[PDB]
RNA sequence: GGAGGUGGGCUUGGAAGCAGCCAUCCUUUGAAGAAAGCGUAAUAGCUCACUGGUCUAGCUCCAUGGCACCGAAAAUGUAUC
């Protein structure tokens, strides 16, 4: 879900900056995936 | 939201200011409030939209509003009739037809003021107005 | 909470600018007399900006304050001191910065006209409050004359008996003698309550 | 009963405590009293490498932390849980 | 493991949830119904009691019928057995000092209350009171 | 806060003065329902006072004396028992049937204290029989 | 462990924590809300606020702020030092 501005939703989603742009990956839900 | 009663009308646009009256303000009527960091202009529909946002927010959290009321003041009122020609016309031959009011907003005016029993669920509606408004505001309080 | 200061010889823009920019507050002590005459100081901006928030009262100026006015070098040299009240804090609109600290002397026990809030206390239990009664607290802060010595720290009103449609006027406030209200007629209500919607 | 899982990794601060757990009060000498566990040596890490855990027949699965803790405590709380 | 419910004494168990509320604790129901019939004939009938069953893994479980709830006991001794929706504006009965004393004492002998004195279990049961709509005289 | 911990230490200490026999037991692993059952035998049948308290905090209460011999029994999770002074043992005997029966709870017990001296379970009878401190010595 | 009043009270052909409302109150008191999320035709359960020791050490958020980052796609060929 390529976003201009990610948003952590589930209390187990965590932000990761790699290769330049920040993903937000959520362990529990495979739905709270975001890429800034 | 409208200076509906008789007024001179066709107001000179007038350029926007670099500042407000210089004394650091205090709050007019309620515990928590909001203020404009940067000057500019706000349209009546914009301000009313922010008001909808806030009233409906406390209404939603009736859980904190079902006690009585959660009182709010909005302290800006539309002043200047922003006019505009049609979408296809030769410049000139008169002035626009008045099509929407505007309100000068300086660098320190208090747009919103209120006392919602929860500071948490008041600062929570703080950031929920700059989304629907034109300028950058700030969460202040008494 | 001794505040520290170092003098300045300044007027308006040009110099107070550099004071602020290095971090310093142009402040002024003076006596309740006239022309008005006390030294022209600079508090340290660190000292003042931290102090107003620490009190937690945006009118912290209700409290007599005490100044070391260093004249010399180093962290300080013990010099002329001050017992002055803050009558005015010129807080900047822009973000919350500070511009000016106004200090009037009261060291002598001489009277002053100062600010005291009305913090609401009985709000735990009150008949209208338990009907739900809410209100428009017309007055949150007031000005009281009176000496320098016995100055209160604040007025903690007693709203425990705010009857359903009744109100605490100015007279009902718990004053002290020689702190004559006398500057407002007591017919100004300082709260009420009304049963609006359950 | 069931299995112990001694893991221990010689990188972190090493005190004689976890080596106490390895040599004595757990090994063959203590498997004499806990023989249906097949105690052996594992050489990898889980978390705070001396994180010794014992998993029972329903698995109270009792476990204690690294070198700075007393070995006697690891023994007794893995054996109580 | 160990759970306490508020099932009566004359019948066996709550019929509608009889299956899965307890029957995946591996609990053995039939001989337990017989045993509870025994406990009920031992005790007196027609009073909603609290029961504190404990189950295990070894196909062996036990069942303690200690005592009835003191608050529903209050309701049954007074005459109004209801739990109102507004405990703070709808009060049901008028309890007295001696019914308080008797109810607490008969529960004092039972494991229901760890309180030893009379005033402390009195306050416990008048807490039960003020939870619903009960008005202790004095 | 600090004021809370000082009050907890003082109340534990005042109980330590009016008791005459103390039992210190590991109580980790145990369900709440079992603790309520233990309390019923402990208070209704033996009139005893039980507290689970922090080891650092208990040291300060035993610091008042005479339970200074119970200092090394505060390593790991501690439940204390204070029996009434006019009452001799009984709680100690219960804490044993209650330890032995409840193997799912894995209580490691501990050392009790009478005559001001912590005594071993094998030596409990020998120390109890001899009234004077170091009477055998 | 997140207890027993408790499966609260109500709805309900089914509601115990979770289709859904009142209620936030009882007590054990090691914990505990009339269980947060998920669901289970109700269940149960988790884990959740809420746990004892061990950890062995400088940790965490408040802003004064400074320079970074992301949003930021055109036409023949880099083509905005």
Curated annotation (Swiss-Prot), chain B:
GO CC annotation: mitochondrial large ribosomal subunit
Subcellular location: Mitochondrion
Quaternary data: Component of the mitochondrial ribosome large subunit.
Parent-record interval covered: 37 to 178 of 179
GO terms for biological process, alphabetical: mitochondrial translation
Record's keyword terms, sorted: Mitochondrion, Ribonucleoprotein, Ribosomal protein
Protein name per the record: Large ribosomal subunit protein uL16m
Superkingdom of the source species: Eukaryota
Family: Belongs to the universal ribosomal protein uL16 family.
Any one GO molecular-function label of the UniProt entry: structural constituent of ribosome
Keyword Ribosomal protein belongs to the record: yes
């Amino acid at each position: 879900k390529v976003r201009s501005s990610v948003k952590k939703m589930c209390e187990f989603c965590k932000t990761v900056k790699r290769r330049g742009r920040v993903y937000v990956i959520c362990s529990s839900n495979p739905k709270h995936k975001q890429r800034q | 939201l409208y200076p509906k009663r008789t007024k001179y009308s066709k107001y000179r646009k007038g350029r926007c200011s670099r500042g407000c009256k210089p004394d650091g303000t205090k709050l007019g009527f309620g515990r928590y409030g909001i203020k404009s960091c940067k000057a500019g202009c706000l349209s009546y529909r914009a301000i009313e939209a922010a008001r909808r946002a806030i009233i409906g927010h406390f209404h939603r959290a009736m859980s904190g509003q079902f006690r009585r009321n959660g009182k709010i003041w909005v302290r800006v009122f539309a002043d200047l009739p922003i006019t505009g020609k049609p979408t296809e016309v030769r410049m000139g031959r008169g002035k626009g037809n008045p099509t929407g009011w505007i309100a000068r907003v300086s660098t320190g005016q208090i747009l919103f003021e209120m006392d919602g029993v929860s500071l948490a669920n008041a600062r929570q509606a703080a950031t929920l107005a700059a989304h629907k408004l034109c300028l950058s505001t700030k969460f202040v309080q008494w | 909470q001794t505040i520290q200061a170092i003098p300045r010889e300044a007027t308006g823009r040009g110099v107070s600018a550099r004071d602020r920019t290095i971090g310093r507050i142009p402040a002024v002590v003076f006596p309740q007399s006239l022309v008005s005459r006390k030294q022209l100081l600079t508090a340290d901006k660190k000292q003042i900006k931290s102090i107003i928030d620490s009190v937690g009262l945006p009118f912290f100026c209700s409290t007599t304050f005490q100044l070391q006015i260093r004249a010399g070098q180093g962290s300080s040299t013990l010099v002329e001191s001050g017992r002055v009240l803050p009558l005015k804090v010129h807080r900047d609109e822009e973000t919350g910065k500070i511009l000016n600290l106004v200090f009037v002397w009261a060291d002598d026990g001489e009277k002053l006209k100062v600010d005291v809030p009305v913090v609401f206390k009985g709000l735990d239990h009150c008949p209208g409050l338990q009907k739900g009664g809410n209100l428009r607290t017309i007055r949150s802060t007031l000005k009281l004359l009176g000496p320098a010595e016995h100055i209160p720290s604040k007025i903690e009103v007693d709203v425990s008996n705010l009857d359903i449609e009744d109100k605490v006027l100015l007279q009902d406030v718990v004053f002290h003698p020689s702190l004559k209200l006398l500057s407002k007629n007591e017919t100004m209500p300082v709260c009420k309550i009304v049963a609006t919607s359950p | 009963l069931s299995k112990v899982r001694i893991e221990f990794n010689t990188l972190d601060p090493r005190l004689a405590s976890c080596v106490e757990f390895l040599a004595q009060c757990n090994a063959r000498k203590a498997k004499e009293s806990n023989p249906n566990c097949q105690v052996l040596v594992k050489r990898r890490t889980d978390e705070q490498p001396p994180q010794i855990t014992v998993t029972f027949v329903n698995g109270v699965e009792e476990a204690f932390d690294a070198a700075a803790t007393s070995a006697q405590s690891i023994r007794k709380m893995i054996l109580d849980k | 493991a160990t759970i306490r419910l508020t099932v009566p004494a004359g019948g066996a168990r709550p019929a509608p949830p009889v299956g899965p509320a307890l029957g995946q604790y591996r609990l053995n129901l039939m001989a337990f119904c017989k045993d509870f019939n025994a406990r009920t004939q031992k005790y007196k009938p027609d009073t909603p009691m609290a029961v504190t069953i404990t189950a295990f893994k070894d196909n062996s479980f036990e069942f303690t019928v200690k005592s009835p709830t003191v608050s529903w006991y209050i309701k049954k001794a007074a005459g109004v057995d209801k739990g109102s929706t507004r405990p703070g504006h709808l009060s049901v009965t008028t309890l007295s000092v001696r019914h308080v004393y008797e109810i607490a004492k008969v529960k004092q002998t039972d494991p229901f209350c760890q309180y030893m004195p009379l005033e402390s279990i009195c306050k416990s049961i008048i807490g039960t009171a003020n939870s619903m709509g009960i008005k202790i005289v004095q | 806060s600090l004021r809370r911990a000082l009050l907890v230490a003082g109340k534990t200490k005042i109980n330590l003065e009016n008791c005459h026999f103390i039992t210190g037991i590991n109580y980790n692993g145990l369900s709440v329902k079992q603790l309520q059952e233990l309390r019923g035998i402990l208070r209704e049948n033996t009139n005893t006072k039980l507290l689970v308290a922090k080891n650092t905090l208990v040291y300060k209460a035993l610091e008042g004396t005479k339970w200074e011999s119970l200092k090394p029994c505060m390593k790991g999770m501690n439940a204390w028992l204070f029996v009434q002074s006019e009452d001799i043992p009984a709680a100690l005997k219960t804490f044993i049937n209650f330890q032995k029966e409840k193997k799912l709870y894995d209580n490691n017990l501990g050392g009790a204290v009478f005559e001001e001296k912590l005594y071993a379970p094998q030596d409990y009878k020998v120390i109890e029989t001899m009234p004077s401190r170091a009477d055998v010595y």
